[PDB]
Ligand binder design. Structure first.
Ligand code: HEM
Length: 154
């Protein structure tokens, strides 16, 4: 929906923690996604040979993709909602090439929140959680708009 300026400030303050260790966050987020929602792994021809968490933790290539994911998300979040320019290519690849259902963006949003609780206990309270959830919900809703514009049902 629309975040307050206060809420965006909180979102970006938590993001600065992500930016201090991008690869470790990105690795944790993709592995959490694959553990909580294994169906999502099946969509990655690149990774689906990885069978266990331990195997996933040992893939440098998974870590690299985690950086790529978070770099993109970060650019989006820094736009504080004014992210049309960022969402157009992302929606195009994800709807038309990777063919990812929108529901999976809910799953990755859940993984992000989980990893923030795991990595930043004592520094990720109800206020920050609420703000980040709003930002991720806006992102998902706006990607779903872009899927529809491409002619899909996400
Ligand atoms: C925060 C949410 C996400 C962001 C920011 C994101 C971002 C990216 C970026 C930047 C790329 C590389 C460029 C491109 O192809 O667009 C990518 C590739 C990809 N994404 Fe995502 N992604 C997200 C969620 C998801 C989810 C939830 C899935 C599947 C369940 C998914 C599946 C893929 C696949 C399959 C590729 C190609 C990977 C490869 O073979 O190299 N993405 N994503």
């Amino acid at each position: 929906m629309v975040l307050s300026e206060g809420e965006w400030q909180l979102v970006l303050h938590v993001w600065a923690k992500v930016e201090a260790d991008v690869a470790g966050h990105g690795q944790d987020i993709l592995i959490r996604l694959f553990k909580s929602h294994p169906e999502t792994l099946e969509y990655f021809d690149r990774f689906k040979h990885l069978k266990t968490e331990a195997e996933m933790k040992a893939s440098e290539d998974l870590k690299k993709h985690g950086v790529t994911v978070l770099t993109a998300l970060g650019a989006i979040l820094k736009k504080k909602g004014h992210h049309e320019a960022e969402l157009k290519p992302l929606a195009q690849s994800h709807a038309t090439k990777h063919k990812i259902p929108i529901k999976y963006l809910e799953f990755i949003s859940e993984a992000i929140i989980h990893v923030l609780h795991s990595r930043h206990p004592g520094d990720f309270g109800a206020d920050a959680q609420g703000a980040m959830n709003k930002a991720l919900e806006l992102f998902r809703k706006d990607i779903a708009a872009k899927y529809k514009e491409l002619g899909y049902q996400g």
